[PDB]
């Protein structure tokens, strides 16, 4: 049983509840000197499209979607709990906006098939960005000017060097990828020592890598 | 201005840029006393929502929308009612 | 035999009990100067969907479900006893929310068969998350960029070294 | 404002932005006395409820 009358509106509830979703201008709010139970300014603070149904775990329940940006806020109310939690998730709501300023000239060279957005490519300078969902998540490898140069810089920064560190670490595994994300690391029988042999031939890659320990 | 409504009060004006005339009547002045600014060399006025200017054989009155002037003035007075059009714009300094 | 009349409500009990589940605004509560036996503000404190039926082991009994999030609270009242116990379980109620912020862009690439949620996969960066229930519990092995690299890093961190210890 | 109800009291208004007029009547003023703010260059108002 709480009520408020203003702006050409007599809203009278009785023996049950009903909260208001703001949309007010200069609304007086309290009467009889007492409050409704506490004024709630949507400026300081329940965030736009999601109302606080909240339970013991202080999680927000009710929420509505309208746009992708709204879906972010819709998600926000779920992983938000204690202060640091809601703050992180709150930021993640905006953080997950469009491509956070890679360059000025941003179109949308996205690949799509029958309405469903297939893959989201995005190439430019020191980076080729590939977001997929039917074969993984997202991959972005920085270049310098060309795709090749990405492979080059990677090839320079490749793992076959750390082999010496691992030697001292205690267990020599020896891994080494390839420029084009080529996977070459394998696993030998090495409780302590027992070599590392492998011989590939025929139309594929005639290369035998024999390694001793 | 008694209760709720207004007795007779009215807000409207016009200006006499005429040389030679006492001015004050019944102790009070017209409302202000100013000498000539010696107007516009290469300035003009930008009229926005309902703004007007009358001079040089020209009554240009806009209403509820805008319309800026592209100068081409000589000695154009520009502001009236003491207030400006929103700001004088001399095409010499810009 | 306790009663309260307000907000267009004459609630009179007699010779037996009946507690109220709040839902009040500005309700006066005590009369005759005396209390009902003690005011219970649901703000400080019995937690939302679960009422304190409580026995010698101070455990909450009655509870209702509505959503998954509610089921968490429903569970909460069971493993909660002494302070440190109820606090831990109380936290676990919220702690067990959705995937606690792995990344921003979180959809729901879960595998399901005939209504029953089969498995819950979740891949991204430095981690592939696989929650199952028909062949175990949950497994999450961190990578660096690719599945292979997970295997690599693991291969480096493998046990055959401790043999000396 | 006697008991429960209101005698005659009324809250409504309108403004005279007119140049030249004494203003006060029977000792009291209209309710306030202000000179022109010299309004809006590039401002506006957002109307809500």
UniProtKB/Swiss-Prot annotation, chain D:
MVP 3 mediates interaction with PTEN. MVP 4 mediates interaction with PARP4. This is Major vault protein. Required for normal vault structure. Vaults are multi-subunit structures that may act as scaffolds for proteins involved in signal transduction. Vaults may also play a role in nucleo-cytoplasmic transport. Down-regulates IFNG-mediated STAT1 signaling and subsequent activation of JAK. Down-regulates SRC activity and signaling through MAP kinases. The chain holds residues 183 to 231 of 861 of the full protein. MVP repeats lie at residues 1-35. Phosphorylated on Tyr residues after EGF stimulation. The vault ribonucleoprotein particle is a huge (400 A x 670 A) cage structure of 12.9 MDa. It consists of a dimer of half-vaults, with each half-vault comprising 39 identical major vault protein (MVP) chains, PARP4 and one or more vault RNAs (vRNAs). Interacts with TEP1. Interacts with PTEN and activated MAPK1. The phosphorylated protein interacts with the SH2 domains of PTPN11 and SRC. Interacts with APEX1. May interact with ZNF540. It is found in: Cytoplasm; Nucleus.
């Amino acid at each position: 049983l709480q009520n408020f009358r203003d702006l050409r509106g007599v809203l009278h509830r009785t023996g049950e509840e009903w909260l208001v979703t703001v949309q007010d201008t200069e609304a007086h709010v309290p009467d009889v000197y007492e409050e409704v139970l506490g004024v709630v300014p949507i400026t300081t603070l329940k965030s736009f499209f999601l109302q606080p149904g909240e339970r013991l775990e202080r999680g927000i329940q009710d929420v509505y979607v309208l746009s992708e940006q709204q879906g972010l806020l819709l998600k926000a109310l779920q992983p938000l709990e204690e202060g640091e939690s809601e703050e992180k998730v709150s930021h993640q709501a905006g953080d997950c906006w469009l491509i956070r300023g890679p360059l000025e000239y941003v179109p949308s060279a996205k690949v799509e098939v029958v309405e469903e957005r297939q893959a989201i490519p995005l190439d430019q300078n020191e980076g080729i960005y590939v977001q997929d969902v039917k074969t993984g998540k997202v991959r972005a490898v920085i270049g310098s000017t060309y795709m090749l140069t990405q492979d080059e810089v990677l090839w320079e920064k490749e793992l076959p060097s750390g082999v010496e560190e691992l030697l001292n670490l205690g267990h020599d595994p020896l891994a080494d990828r390839g420029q084009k994300g080529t996977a070459k690391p394998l696993q030998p029988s090495a409780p302590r020592n027992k070599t590392r042999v492998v011989s590939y031939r025929v139309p594929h890659n005639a290369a035998v890598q024999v390694y001793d320990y | 201005f008694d209760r709720e409504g207004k007795g007779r009060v009215t807000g409207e004006e016009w200006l006499v840029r005429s040389v030679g005339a006492y001015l004050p009547a019944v102790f009070e002045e017209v409302l202000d006393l100013v000498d000539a600014v010696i107007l516009t060399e290469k300035t003009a006025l930008h009229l926005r929502a309902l703004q007007n200017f009358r001079d040089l054989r020209g009554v240009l009155h806009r209403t509820g929308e805008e319309w800026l002037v592209t100068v081409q003035d000589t000695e154009a007075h520009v502001p009236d009612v003491y207030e400006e059009v929103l700001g004088v714009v001399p095409i010499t300094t810009l």
